[PDB]
From a paper:
Cyanophycin, a nonribosomally synthesized polypeptide consisting of equimolar amounts of aspartate and arginine as the backbone and branched sidechain, respectively, was first identified in cyanobacteria in the form of opaque and light-scattering cytoplasmic granules. The biosynthesis of cyanophycin is achieved by a single enzyme named cyanophycin synthetase (CphA1) that catalyzes peptide elongation coupled with ATP hydrolysis.
The cryo-EM data of the substrate-bound state were collected under a high concentration of l-aspartate (100 mM), cyanophycin primer peptide, (β-Asp-Arg)4, and ATPγS. The TeCphA1 structure in the substrate-bound state visualizes the initial state of the catalytic reaction for the ATP-dependent addition of aspartate to the C-terminal backbone carboxy group of cyanophycin. While (β-Asp-Arg)4 was observed in all protomers, the substrate aspartate was observed only in one protomer (chain D). The substrate aspartate was visualized in the most stable Gω. The substrate aspartate was accommodated in a small space beside Ser396. Asn394, a residue on the large loop of Gω (residues 389‒399), and Arg323 interacted with the β-carboxy group of the substrate aspartate at distances of 2.5 Å and 3.4 Å, respectively. In the substrate-bound state, His267 on the P-loopG is located between γ-phosphate and the C-terminal backbone carboxy group of (β-Asp-Arg)4. Cyanophycin and aspartate binding further changes Glid to a closed conformation, and the orientation of Gω is fixed to localize aspartate in a suitable position for the reaction by the interaction of Asn394 on the large loop with the substrate.
Residue numbers in the entry:
A (entry chain D): 1 to 724
B (entry chain K), F (entry chain J): 1 to 3, 5
C (entry chain B): 115 to 228
D (entry chain B): 456 to 569
E (entry chain A): 570 to 683
Write the structure that this text describes.
């Protein structure tokens, strides 16, 4: 048991397409090479007692326990290591259902491919599976303490490399809409789209959310002043830094009752809602000052009514939810003492940062609040009426939310949209205290308590007493207004012998149109006319540089076999996929030992073409032409021999081919011939003395033509491109 | 802050 | 005419006191004069924008773009209605929170640029 | 801060404020919206409301202030007299108003001008 | 009168006026009314009554997406269609609602519709 | 803070 190499794949790869997340390990079986499970004494019993959850594995038999049946029959240990890795990382809450095992050319090493949900978790599961199997073959069993330790480590790895619920929802909406998304390495930022069409979100703030609006929302007094200057009904109040200003600030608001709360607090840190006498006032001031980070508190008039949270996205009201504090209703002739734990037994109860409906936490502060309530633990509710436990009305403590989006008055919608625009927030969460949200805030004495930037919408997507609202859909509509993804044209060039020249020629041709082209070749990574990075720069690690640049409009990426083998493609799909040729020259590197394997590996580019894209294939190469099937999207053929029967048959029904007919680089659009240049005025062809250069020019011209590039632009780019 |  | 509202009101209030003292005693004490001058200078300094905001406001006035002072966080509003823009000192209303926060982070900025 | 750019002391000064205002207002465009000021002795409110209705027929958001109150679009933004500059600022600073029709009573002009 | 339609709506097929032309059976009438459903372009939509078995039978042999409407919110075919995809409409609890998969979008109370 |  020795792990030679451990590679992780992130895009389309040689092993699978549409299974981007895979881990491949080169596993040595020095002494355990050619013995089956039946040849190992007691292996099956130990394996099935350590991991009884192997019974659900549907192997090639396709029936319940088929993998087990294969184990009694006796197979190679690589298969069982694959299966135990899959089940080990599945038991940690990460469902994975893909796996492969293949014998390599070398005498002992195998290749095990395991699907993963988390990169670190997948690698850890792969590393742990071999240890588990070695321990079983050595001692007949695996310790349960080590299994629990590994499962806990896997769960910790899954939790650590996880986004937030808001980020998860937005990312899932992006995937549903086909918008590419990647994770930036700075501040948990997510980039949607490519190039000039890209957007960024952190949690709910986008790259278009203003600094001024966010900073004004965080300023309670500044927000109140601005809203009052706009005629918005904000609560009447003032700030009080010291003890002596309590009375004077009290008479300002207009009598009793009043509210005491610090301005440097959030999530109800030390806020006292209702006070009706001086002793309560001074106690509230002391408590808020203790909770205040700057010893500063604000006083204001107390407004009766329910607490509502209104979510405004792109200036439109998306969701309205009323926050009811933790309460129990005794309509079943039962008191609080039973209901406190009766509610706690609801499966909807959940702690952490995933289940929004938190269990009813009975703290000593809660005991004090229920003492103020006027009833006790065994005091049965009267008539079966709601009896509260606190007054903060927060989902983090055990409150509930009620959807009121369909009941909000149109005047309230207009007012809240105006408030969000005045503050300057594209996504805002407005807290409203009002007796009835179905009536305008002027008739009832409703107020705007505060405006929150970067709000959490977990309470709107799962109200628990109403209809869920597609908040992530509204956010993504704001980010990408129409039916537009964030994609830019991507042209991936692959092949054995002409990748760099074709890439440079494509970039030069596209530069003729007024577009910024970011292309990576063997020489280096270029953005426009300037060199972005030196070195090889051929794998996806350089494709990300092009795709993340805010100025790149078209991406032309040279995709060598090494990058695809190491970590797969750097993109889910490409607008144009070019396969130039497949020749067995550097054979034996990696697991590629036959030219059929090389063709399969190079076919990843062709098979990753989107259904609306094109695959530019060489009709003269039988292996490349054989990739005509299993390709989504149209196929375009280029051939240095104009009498290619496959190309002619393809042009007869359809078209989009390129040939070299009579000293001419020509595009065939079916029954029409469009000549580009005499191929002796093309400098790279060396007056037509270099057939390889002519083939590269054919491929590049066909690729740009398939994208609608105008003919004279192609001609100018082909004539002005110099070999260098 | 975050997720207000 | 005034340049600062508080300074102008203070000058108007002090002028009548100075004239009354002159008519009553024939002169005004130099200590009171220097106290009033220092108070006026303090009022001028207090209600003054920064050189960045001053320069931007001067350019806006030169271009005939209306400007007003918001009462929250020393924000200046340019224009009216749907055509309005806001600046604080150099940040505009279109400056992103994410960009500013990333710039403030030295290691995050280095990682992103690398 | 662009202080060292507008007064280098060892080279040519650069118009940074001009660049900032070009960013804020790209073309030769000010931030103004059409302002219609109605004054007179006996018909300010009716004329203001009729003008607001006529402009509302065009697909524009009209913010107008009259003696009855301040209106933005079809909804009342503020109650009271609202015929002075203190109510004109509410209309002129609203991010949704495209046309401003202001009833300018003589009291506001006498008190604090336009 | 057209080669294709963006939306093709089939409300119901009831055998009432049979015998006209060559149409003598309700199957023939359904086949005749299915011309509209089958003329929908691949990017178009076919709005079919899930509550009508004959109209719902036109779900196949139709190019483009299919949308179901039903006065009964518990229609098994409609619910199965919404679970995998969406774009349906129901009358659930005194509401005219649009089902976009797992999302419910209410339009009106159906008592405010004259 | 401010003007950097
Ligand atoms: N003046 C007021 N009158 C009536 N209720 C108020 C008043 N101020 C606050 N509240 C209530 O107290 C709740 C919390 O007030 P906040 O000022 O938002 O305190 P907080 O520190 O911001 O806590 P969060 O983060 O907003 S939940 C509001 O949601 C209202 O329900
Ligand atoms: N279409 C072609 N068919 C065969 N040989 C070619 C072709 N195009 C170029 N060559 C030859 O291959 C050499 C290298 O090709 P390049 O395109 O410059 O590099 P490359 O294809 O990127 O190879 P790598 O793997 O990136 S180093 C050229 O100098 C030619 O001699
Ligand atoms: N052009 C006019 N000439 C004379 N009287 C007029 C005219 N237009 C209206 N009035 C009358 O003047 C009354 C008061 O004027 P309004 O237009 O209603 O309000 P107003 O002009 O703003 O008065 P103030 O300044 O707000 S108290 C109206 O009710 C009419 O009867
Ligand atoms: N509120 C926000 C938090 C997720 C990002 N924070 C951390 N520590 N990863 C969310 O998306 O819920
Ligand atoms: N809700 C939150 C707003 C803080 C803004 N977020 C960041 N990252 N600056 C609050 O503190 O109220
Ligand atoms: N840097 C900026 C701030 C100067 C004045 N500051 C405040 N808060 N008024 C500037 O304008 O130069
Ligand atoms: N230069 C300045 C950057 C801080 C960004 N400004 C605000 N208001 N967050 C600094 O303080 O160094
Ligand atoms: N997003 C919060 C709700 C709140 O801010 O009150 C939660 O997780 O419950
Ligand atoms: Mg808050
Ligand atoms: Mg709040
Ligand atoms: Mg190369
Ligand atoms: Mg009037």
């Amino acid at each position: 048991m020795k792990i030679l190499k451990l590679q992780t794949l992130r895009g389309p790869n040689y092993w699978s397409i549409h299974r981007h997340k895979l881990v491949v390990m080169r596993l040595d079986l020095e002494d355990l090479y050619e013995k089956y499970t039946s040849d190992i004494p007691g292996f099956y019993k130990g394996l099935t007692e350590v991991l009884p959850s192997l019974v659900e594995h549907l192997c090639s038999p396709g029936v319940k326990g088929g993998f087990l049946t294969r184990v009694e029959k006796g197979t190679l240990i690589g298969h069982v290591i694959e299966h135990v890795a899959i089940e080990l990382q599945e038991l940690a809450g990460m469902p994975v259902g893909f796996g492969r095992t293949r014998e390599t050319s070398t005498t002992g090493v195998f290749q095990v491919v395991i699907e993963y949900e988390n990169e670190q978790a997948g690698r850890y599961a792969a590393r742990a599976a071999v240890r588990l199997c070695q321990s079983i073959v050595d001692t007949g069993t695996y310790p349960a303490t080590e299994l629990q330790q590994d499962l806990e480590d896997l769960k910790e790895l899954k939790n650590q490399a996880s986004l937030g619920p808001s980020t998860e929802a937005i990312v899932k909406e992006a995937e549903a809409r086909g918008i590419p998304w990647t994770q930036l390495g700075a501040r948990f930022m997510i980039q949607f789209g490519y190039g000039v069409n890209q957007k960024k979100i952190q949690a709910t703030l986008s790259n278009q959310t203003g600094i001024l609006g966010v900073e004004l929302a965080c300023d309670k007094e500044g927000t109140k002043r601005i809203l009052k200057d706009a005629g918005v009904p904000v609560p009447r109040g003032t700030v009080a830094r010291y003890f002596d200003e309590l009375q004077d600030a009290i008479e300002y608001v207009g009598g009793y009752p009043i509210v005491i709360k610090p301005l440097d607090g959030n999530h109800g840190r030390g806020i006292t809602i209702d006070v009706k006498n001086w002793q309560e006032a001074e106690e509230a001031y002391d408590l808020a000052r203790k909770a205040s980070k700057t010893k500063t508190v604000i006083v204001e008039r107390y407004y009766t009514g329910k607490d509502h949270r209104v979510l405004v996205v792109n200036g439109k009201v998306v969701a309205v939810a009323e926050r009811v504090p933790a309460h129990v209703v005794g309509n079943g002739k039962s008191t609080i003492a039973e209901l406190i734990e009766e509610t706690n037994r609801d499966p909807q109860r959940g702690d952490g940062h995933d289940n929004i409906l938190t269990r009813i936490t009975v703290d000593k502060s809660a005991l004090d609040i229920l003492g103020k309530q006027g009833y006790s633990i065994d005091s049965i509710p009267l008539k079966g009426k709601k009896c509260f436990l606190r007054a903060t009305a927060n989902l983090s403590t055990g409150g509930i939310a009620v959807d009121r989006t369909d009941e909000i008055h149109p005047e309230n919608v207009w007012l809240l949209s105006r408030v969000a625009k005045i503050i300057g927030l594209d996504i805002a969460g407005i807290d409203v205290v009002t007796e009835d949200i179905s009536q305008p805030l002027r008739e009832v004495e409703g107020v705007i308590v505060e405006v929150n930037a970067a709000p959490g919408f977990r309470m709107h997507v799962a109200p628990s007493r109403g209809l869920a609202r597609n908040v992530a859909g509204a956010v993504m509509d704001m980010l990408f207004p129409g039916s537009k993804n964030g994609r830019i044209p991507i042209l991936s060039v692959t092949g054995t012998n002409g990748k760099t020249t074709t890439t440079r020629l494509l970039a030069h041709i596209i530069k003729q149109t007024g577009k910024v082209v970011g292309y990576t070749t063997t020489d280096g990574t270029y953005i426009g006319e300037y060199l972005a990075e030196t070195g090889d720069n051929t794998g996806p690690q350089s494709a990300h540089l092009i795709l993340s640049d805010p100025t790149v409009e078209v991406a032309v990426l040279e995709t060598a076999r090494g990058g695809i083998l190491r970590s797969g493609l750097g993109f889910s799909s490409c607008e144009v996929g070019i396969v130039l040729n497949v020749t067995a020259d550097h054979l034996g590197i990696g697991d590629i030992d036959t030219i059929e394997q090389l063709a399969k590996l190079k076919s990843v580019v062709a098979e990753s073409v989107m259904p609306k894209g094109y695959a530019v294939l060489n009709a003269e190469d039988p292996l490349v032409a054989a990739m005509a099937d299993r390709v989504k999207g149209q196929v375009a053929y280029f051939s240095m021999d104009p009498n290619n029967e496959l190309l002619l048959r393809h042009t007869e029904a359809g078209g989009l081919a390129a040939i070299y007919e009579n000293g001419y680089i020509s595009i065939l659009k079916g029954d029409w011939t469009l000549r580009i240049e005499k191929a002796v005025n093309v400098p790279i062809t060396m007056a037509g003395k270099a057939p390889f250069m002519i083939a590269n020019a054919l491929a590049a011209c066909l690729a740009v033509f398939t994208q609608g590039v105008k003919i004279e632009h192609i001609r100018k780019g082909l004539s002005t491109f110099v070999a260098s | 802050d975050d997720d207000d």
